[PDB]
């Protein structure tokens, strides 16, 4: 454990009082209570282990193979499977999901930033103070994304826009978190600048609901430790005093509402869960979205460095390595991702057990207008494979395999053939339903959430960058409210 205040010990952790309880150490939570703890008293709960020593989360090349591993409680991959049959992960790491992802980081649009109505200048200082710590700008492109990025030009995929940050329509280089020497800089890197006598970071901690006082009102946690106990811990008794605030992600933050009692009466009574607060759009319009793809096999990893912005945001086309098997074995892809879908579902519990995945249904391309615009993005990837780029490229391994430029029923194909998720799910505590502009729960107090569950739309092109950038924010904005 590279900061002493990160621990295994539930009992001496809950025995204290705090200003803040954060709940998941990822990829909001890290940067929250980091900002949080210069000022406050700080407990953050996180149910996974510690990313650091392991080789399959600090070395870039070996992504993907967690996901491959995964068992049921203790693994920092936790596979889960929607209701329409489409497999799927999360993280179960401090760290969250940016311990276990492609490690792609770009911004949200400016028209998305003034949609969500933050502050722009915070916002652009909350990316900054994120990016000084772990975005990296590429050195060099590898022969595969010279080929890529040269191919979406060619594919008329413009402007051509270098490499930036900001999301702007046509084609970029971005940057990632994985660093020159290959080494992955997670979110539990941003807790550098904690407040080490503020701040508790409590491993192996899976919170199983919130409690609250004789609006209700949040006055702590419970959460069970590896060992099969379960410990209580409180807060520390116009602003608003102490908070509970979740950031336990997509799945995790509208499940452990609902296990708090917080959701819609009839589900809770199915469960028979006491009723808190009647709260029905808890785990309600949810939202994954779907990408088509062609892969091909290599021995060679290369990390994403390339997105294609097609026109009016519509779809995002990128081309992905990721480990397969153990020079290693690569699948190397080229994906379109529906940027905004029309198709939404729901959260659901499956038990009482705060360990369990949630059932999760998406209903992708339940909109057939997500499902032409599957095709349209997939027209994209034909014309790149077409441009003498791609063609020429030692690096592809696509030569082989040709699309039809014109043929739109071999592209709809493929669209049905390759349905995956790329893991941007997000929804369920979403802003204007659940929570308000203030991430504060309807109807609660000292309950906050946020995380990628109070999303409609998926921020930027891969949303990790905007994630850690609201966790970095909204501490900002609850040091703020105090003066
Ligand atoms: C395989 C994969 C690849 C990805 N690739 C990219 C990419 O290249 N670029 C990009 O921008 N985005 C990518 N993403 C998405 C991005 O990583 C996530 O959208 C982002 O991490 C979500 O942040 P969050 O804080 O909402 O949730 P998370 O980062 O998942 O953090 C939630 C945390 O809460 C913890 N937790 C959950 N429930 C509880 C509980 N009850 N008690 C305690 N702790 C709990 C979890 O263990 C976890 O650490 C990828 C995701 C995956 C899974
Ligand atoms: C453990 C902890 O954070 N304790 C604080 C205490 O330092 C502070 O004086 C008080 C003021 O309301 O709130 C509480
Ligand atoms: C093994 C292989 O080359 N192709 C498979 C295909 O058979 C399968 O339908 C699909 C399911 O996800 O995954 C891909
Ligand atoms: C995980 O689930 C499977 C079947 O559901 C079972 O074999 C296994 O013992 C479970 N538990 C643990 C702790 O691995
Ligand atoms: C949590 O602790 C239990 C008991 O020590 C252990 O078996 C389990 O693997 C741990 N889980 C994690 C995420 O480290
Ligand atoms: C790799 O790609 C092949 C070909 O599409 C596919 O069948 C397989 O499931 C992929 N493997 C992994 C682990 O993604
Ligand atoms: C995959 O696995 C082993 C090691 O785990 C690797 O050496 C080998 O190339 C592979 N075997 C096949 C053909 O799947
Ligand atoms: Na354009
Ligand atoms: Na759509
Ligand atoms: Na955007």
Same mark, same amino acid.
């Given at each position: 454990?590279?900061?002493?205040?990160? $621990?295994?010990?539930?009992?001496?952790?809950?025995?204290?009082?705090?200003?803040?309880?954060?709940?998941? *150490?990822?990829?909001?939570?890290?940067?929250?209570?980091?900002?949080?703890?210069?000022?406050?008293?700080?407990?953050?709960?996180?149910? /996974? *282990?510690?990313?650091?020593?392991?080789?399959? =989360?600090?070395?870039?090349?070996?992504? *993907?193979?967690?996901?491959?591993?995964?068992?049921?409680?203790?693994?920092?991959?936790?596979?889960? =499977?929607?209701?329409?049959?489409?497999?799927?992960?999360?993280?179960?790491?401090?760290? *969250?999901?940016?311990?276990?992802?492609?490690?792609?980081?770009?911004?949200?649009?400016?028209?998305?930033?003034?949609?969500?109505?933050?502050?722009?200048?915070?916002?652009?200082?909350? #990316?900054?103070?994120?990016?000084? &710590?772990?975005?990296?700008?590429?050195?060099?492109?590898? %022969?595969?994304?010279?080929?890529?990025?040269?191919?979406?030009?060619?594919?008329?995929?413009?402007?051509?826009?270098?490499?930036?940050?900001? @999301?702007?329509?046509? $084609?970029?280089?971005?940057?990632?978190?994985?660093?020159?020497?290959?080494?992955?800089?997670?979110?539990?890197?941003?807790?550098?600048?904690?407040?080490?006598?503020?701040?508790?970071?409590?491993?192996?901690?899976?919170?199983?609901?919130?409690?609250?006082?004789?609006?209700?009102?949040?006055?702590?946690?419970?959460?069970?430790?590896?060992?099969?106990?379960?410990?209580?811990?409180?807060?520390?008794?116009?602003?608003? /005093?102490?908070?509970?605030?979740?950031?336990?992600?997509?799945?995790?933050?509208?499940?452990?509402?609902?296990?708090?009692?917080?959701?819609?009466?009839?589900?809770?009574?199915?469960?028979?869960?006491?009723?808190?607060?009647?709260?029905?759009?808890? /785990?309600?319009?949810?939202?994954?979205?779907?990408?088509?793809?062609?892969?091909?096999?290599?021995?060679?990893?290369? #990390?994403? &460095?390339?997105? /294609?912005?097609?026109?009016?945001?519509?779809?995002?086309?990128?081309?992905?390595?990721?480990?397969?098997?153990?020079?290693?074995? #690569?699948?190397?892809?080229?994906?379109?991702?529906?940027?905004?879908?029309?198709?939404?579902?729901?959260?659901?519990?499956?038990?009482?057990?705060?360990?369990?995945?949630?059932?999760?249904?998406?209903?992708?391309?339940? @909109?057939?207008?997500?499902?032409?615009?599957?095709?349209?993005?997939?027209?994209?990837?034909?014309?790149?494979?077409?441009?003498?780029?791609?063609?020429?490229?030692?690096?592809?391994?696509?030569?082989?395999?040709?699309?039809?430029?014109?043929?739109?029923?071999?592209?709809?194909? =493929?669209?049905?053939?390759?349905?995956?998720?790329?893991?941007?799910? @997000?929804?369920?505590?979403?802003?204007?339903?659940?929570?308000?502009?203030?991430?504060?729960?309807?109807?609660?107090?000292?309950?906050?959430?946020?995380?990628?569950?109070?999303?409609?739309?998926? %921020?930027?092109?891969?949303?990790?960058?905007? $994630?850690?950038?609201?966790?970095?924010?909204?501490?900002?904005?609850?040091?703020?409210?105090?003066?």
């Amino acid at each position: 454990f590279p900061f002493a205040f990160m $621990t295994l010990d539930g009992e001496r952790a809950a025995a204290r009082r705090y200003d803040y309880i954060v709940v998941g *150490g990822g990829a909001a939570g890290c940067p929250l209570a980091a900002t949080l703890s210069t000022r406050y008293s700080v407990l953050v709960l996180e149910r /996974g *282990g510690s990313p650091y020593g392991n080789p399959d =989360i600090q070395n870039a090349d070996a992504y *993907g193979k967690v996901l491959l591993e995964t068992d049921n409680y203790t693994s920092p991959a936790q596979a889960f =499977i929607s209701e329409d049959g489409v497999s799927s992960a999360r993280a179960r790491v401090l760290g *969250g999901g940016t311990a276990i992802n492609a490690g792609f980081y770009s911004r949200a649009s400016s028209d998305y930033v003034s949609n969500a109505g933050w502050d722009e200048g915070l916002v652009e200082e909350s #990316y900054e103070w994120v990016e000084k &710590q772990n975005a990296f700008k590429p050195q060099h492109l590898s %022969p595969w994304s010279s080929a890529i990025r040269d191919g979406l030009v060619e594919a008329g995929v413009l402007p051509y826009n270098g490499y930036t940050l900001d @999301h702007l329509d046509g $084609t970029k280089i971005s940057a990632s978190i994985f660093d020159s020497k290959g080494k992955r800089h997670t979110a539990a890197d941003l807790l550098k600048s904690a407040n080490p006598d503020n701040i508790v970071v409590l491993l192996n901690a899976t919170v199983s609901r919130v409690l609250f006082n004789s609006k209700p009102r949040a006055s702590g946690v419970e959460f069970m430790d590896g060992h099969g106990r379960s410990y209580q811990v409180f807060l520390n008794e116009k602003p608003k /005093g102490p908070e509970v605030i979740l950031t336990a992600g997509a799945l995790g933050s509208p499940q452990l509402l609902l296990l708090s009692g917080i959701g819609p009466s009839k589900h809770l009574r199915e469960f028979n869960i006491p009723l808190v607060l009647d709260l029905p759009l808890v /785990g309600q319009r949810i939202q994954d979205n779907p990408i088509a793809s062609v892969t091909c096999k290599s021995h060679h990893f290369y #990390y994403q &460095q390339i997105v /294609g912005i097609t026109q009016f945001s519509q779809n995002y086309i990128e081309p992905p390595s990721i480990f397969v098997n153990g020079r290693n074995e #690569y699948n190397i892809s080229i994906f379109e991702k529906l940027a905004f879908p029309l198709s939404r579902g729901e959260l659901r519990l499956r038990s009482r057990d705060p360990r369990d995945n949630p059932s999760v249904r998406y209903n992708y391309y339940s @909109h057939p207008l997500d499902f032409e615009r599957c095709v349209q993005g997939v027209r994209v990837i034909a014309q790149l494979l077409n441009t003498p780029s791609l063609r020429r490229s030692n690096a592809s391994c696509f030569h082989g395999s040709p699309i039809n430029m014109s043929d739109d029923a071999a592209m709809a194909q =493929i669209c049905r053939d390759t349905l995956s998720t790329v893991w941007h799910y @997000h929804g369920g505590c979403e802003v204007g339903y659940v929570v308000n502009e203030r991430y504060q729960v309807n109807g609660v107090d000292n309950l906050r959430i946020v995380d990628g569950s109070t999303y409609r739309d998926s %921020p930027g092109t891969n949303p990790q960058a905007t $994630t850690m950038m609201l966790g970095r924010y909204m501490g900002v904005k609850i040091l703020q409210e105090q003066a």
